[PDB]
């Protein structure tokens, strides 16, 4: 039948892709960076502790000014913190308490949230009445919302559990573009620094690179053995990091179109919830299910330090724009700033 | 406060007011009864609903308590990716239809509905998140099932069975079959009720089970256990 011919052609294409990727691997990243000096031991201590959430904290995000942050908890609360003075700026009660994602607009005028209600809610912060009110309610996904990211004041990108991603025009509340191709729940997304492409990681143990305007999949990266939970983009914009349930982190290059480095240890067997990069891109911070955060030398693939101050699973972490601190949230209803 | 300016002091006062509001809301929501509905296929959800896409929430007050009821039957995604969001609910109400003892699924051959319901109970009961959560097992359609034994014996579900073909014992055999799936018989137990058409015993049994669960939760908090 025609389906047999088509699947044989697909297998031939896969073999050709594998051969093309194999022919490009002459040297490894470890060999090239074998003689570079190590970073030593990274010692960081807690400076601030933000209290006020009475349930598990599920997401957090940093502002562009590197002073305000937002955090969502599964008690129907979206709290905006001023980290310098620990003061609370705003507390927003959500209509649905099963929130699972957060986003802060780059301009600082809007916040976005969503979760098990299959709806992305956009709240306006600057009003003439002095209260934060719901400005938009985007609907159309058929699965729980897992990640959302602003592009500007009038464009958002969301990923959800129906194996699809969407680009929404906020003003009209319509799905401008739909990205399809994943065979499992999409768990994370990350925008490029120039905001023209984005990478998405799903439960089919694969990551995909999407062009925002064209809505087409450019490259697919494989290698993980379980569901991918976190994805982060390298500061340069030519590589990215992936964390999954098999207790390993991996680094992928866009131009080489293959894998570069693997970060794993024999004493780590739990899953990874979050990944982030430092300002220069030399350190990679990953939060684990064993209540810890690990700092990895991104070049030599060596353990550098640990952050251990949480009594439950670490669920989210983020590095400020100027790289002066790192914020870590956890299921024990606390957030901590480290530097 | 020695060096704080006027606006800094006002911001601190605003944050204090926000904290007070958060504390009040948390202490109000702490004394609430939250139930999670579970089942396989269509076995009775609206009928279990007694006002006395996404996730469906139902709020009702019985005597002076606030009852929240969460139904996630419309979620078609992977269960293991959000099942930890409900770690901390007061009780899990699992509904099972007794009429599925002889009729199998037509979508997939040899997939009996009762056997397909036992696997879900096995997964939910023995879970890393629900080790201590109380489970209330409802066995619905008792009457309609009762008259079906006259034609098809229980061997259609469990061929390794021999006993009187009456309701009063065949139903108890299923009662035992579902209860033995629990591998944590100590420090955890199941309250099983046979659903009746009187429309009042269901809420009374649920209230009794919830009261017994809250008593054991209070025992741990006040250092007696």
């Amino acid at each position, epitope marked *: 039948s025609e389906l047999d011919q088509l699947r044989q052609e697909a297998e031939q294409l896969k073999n050709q892709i594998r051969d093309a990727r194999k022919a490009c691997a002459d040297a490894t990243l470890s060999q090239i960076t074998n003689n570079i000096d190590p970073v030593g031991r990274i010692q960081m201590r807690t400076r601030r502790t933000l209290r006020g959430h009475l349930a598990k904290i599920y997401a957090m995000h940093w502002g562009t000014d590197s*002073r*305000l942050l937002v955090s969502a908890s599964q008690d129907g609360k979206l709290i905006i913190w*001023d980290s310098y*003075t620990t*003061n609370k*700026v*705003h507390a927003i009660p959500l209509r649905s308490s099963w929130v699972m994602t957060c986003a802060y607009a780059p301009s600082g005028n809007y916040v976005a949230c969503g979760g098990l209600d299959n709806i992305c809610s956009i709240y306006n912060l600057k009003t*003439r*009445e*002095g*209260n934060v009110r719901v400005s938009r309610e985007l609907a159309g996904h058929t699965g729980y919302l897992s990640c959302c990211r602003f592009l500007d004041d009038n464009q958002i990108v969301t990923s959800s559990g129906d194996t699809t991603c969407a680009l929404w025009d906020i003003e009209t509340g319509q799905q401008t573009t739909t990205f399809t191709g994943h065979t499992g729940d999409v768990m994370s997304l990350s925008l490029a620094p120039d905001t023209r492409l984005f990478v998405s990681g799903a439960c089919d143990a694969s990551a995909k690179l999407w062009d925002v305007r064209e809505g087409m999949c450019r490259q697919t990266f494989t290698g993980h053995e379980s569901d991918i939970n976190a994805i982060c983009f390298f500061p340069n914009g030519n590589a990215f990091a992936t964390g999954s349930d098999d207790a390993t982190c991996r680094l992928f290059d866009l131009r080489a179109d293959q894998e570069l480095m693997t970060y794993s240890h024999d004493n780590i067997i739990c899953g990874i919830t979050s990944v982030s990069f430092s300002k220069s891109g030399r350190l990679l911070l990953a939060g684990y299910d064993d209540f810890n955060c690990n700092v990895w030398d991104a070049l030599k693939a060596d353990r550098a330090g640990v952050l251990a101050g949480h009594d439950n699973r670490v669920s989210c972490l983020g590095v400020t724009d100027d790289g002066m601190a790192v914020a870590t949230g956890s299921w024990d209803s606390f957030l901590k700033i480290w530097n | 406060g020695c*060096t704080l*300016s*006027a*606006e*800094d002091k*006002a*911001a601190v*006062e*605003r944050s204090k*007011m926000i904290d007070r509001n958060l504390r009040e809301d948390g202490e109000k929501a702490a004394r609430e009864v939250k139930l999670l509905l579970l089942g396989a296929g269509e076995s009775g959800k609206s009928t279990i609903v007694k006002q006395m896409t996404g996730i469906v929430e139902t709020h009702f007050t019985f005597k002076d308590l606030h009852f929240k009821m969460f139904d996630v039957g419309a979620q078609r995604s992977e269960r293991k990716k959000w099942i930890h969001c409900f770690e901390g609910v007061t009780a899990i109400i699992f509904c099972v239809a007794l009429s599925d003892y002889d009729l199998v699924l037509a979508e997939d051959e040899e997939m009996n509905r009762m056997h397909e319901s036992m696997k879900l109970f096995d997964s939910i009961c023995n879970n890393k998140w629900f080790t201590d959560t109380s489970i209330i097992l409802f066995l619905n359609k008792k009457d309609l099932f009762e008259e079906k034994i006259k034609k098809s014996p229980l061997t259609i579900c469990y061929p390794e069975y021999a006993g009187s073909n009456t309701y009063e014992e065949a139903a108890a055999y299923i009662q035992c079959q579902f209860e033995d799936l629990n591998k944590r018989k100590d420090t955890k137990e199941i309250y099983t009720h046979f659903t009746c058409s009187t429309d009042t015993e269901n809420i009374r049994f649920v209230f009794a089970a919830v009261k017994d669960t809250i008593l054991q939760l209070n025992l741990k908090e006040y250092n007696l256990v």
Partner: single-chain antibody
Amino acid sequence: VQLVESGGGLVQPGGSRKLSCSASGFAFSSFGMHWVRQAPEKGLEWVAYISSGSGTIYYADTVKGRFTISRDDPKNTLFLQMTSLRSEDTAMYYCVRSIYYYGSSPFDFWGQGTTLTVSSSDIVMTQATSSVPVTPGESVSISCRSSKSLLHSNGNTYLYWFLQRPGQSPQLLIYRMSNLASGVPDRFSGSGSGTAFTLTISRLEAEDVGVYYCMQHLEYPLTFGAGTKLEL
């Protein structure tokens, strides 16, 4: 957003009265409130302040022990009860809203005040100008000076620039010496140092005529400048 004042009228010396300010169109309970009075032909003068939640109250030295400020939040109203009124208390009173958090703009709305006529350590803000004859289409520069340093240890300089058009309530132009208020054209700019401050207007549009005031918010006894008048 609206604030409406009621009260005023002829009062004999030694009498009492209750001025009221009714708010509509915004969350009243989230805003701190000020009473600010202006004499018949004088400059602005701060009178009293009540915090959100009524947790903090501040009075001026002239009215301390005589005036009382209160708020009713369910009714969305603000009261000023005045007793033992002297002949120097004849003025127009405004109720002003102000909210304080990181990045907020206090003093951003002024009600249309009510007139009262009675029958017959502190930072000093100097505006050493009275009248500036001007022509449309040319830049202007108003200057204000303080007797202290308004720059705090956290890098914030607490200076505010307000404009009062003839026959209108004052409106906010600049807050914290550099931040332009919402709804203000880009022509207005603020700059300065710890002590000397300058407000620059790039191109006049024959509408900016009026009196410009500089106010300090470093410490709660609030001081206004004498004011600078722009006439053509």
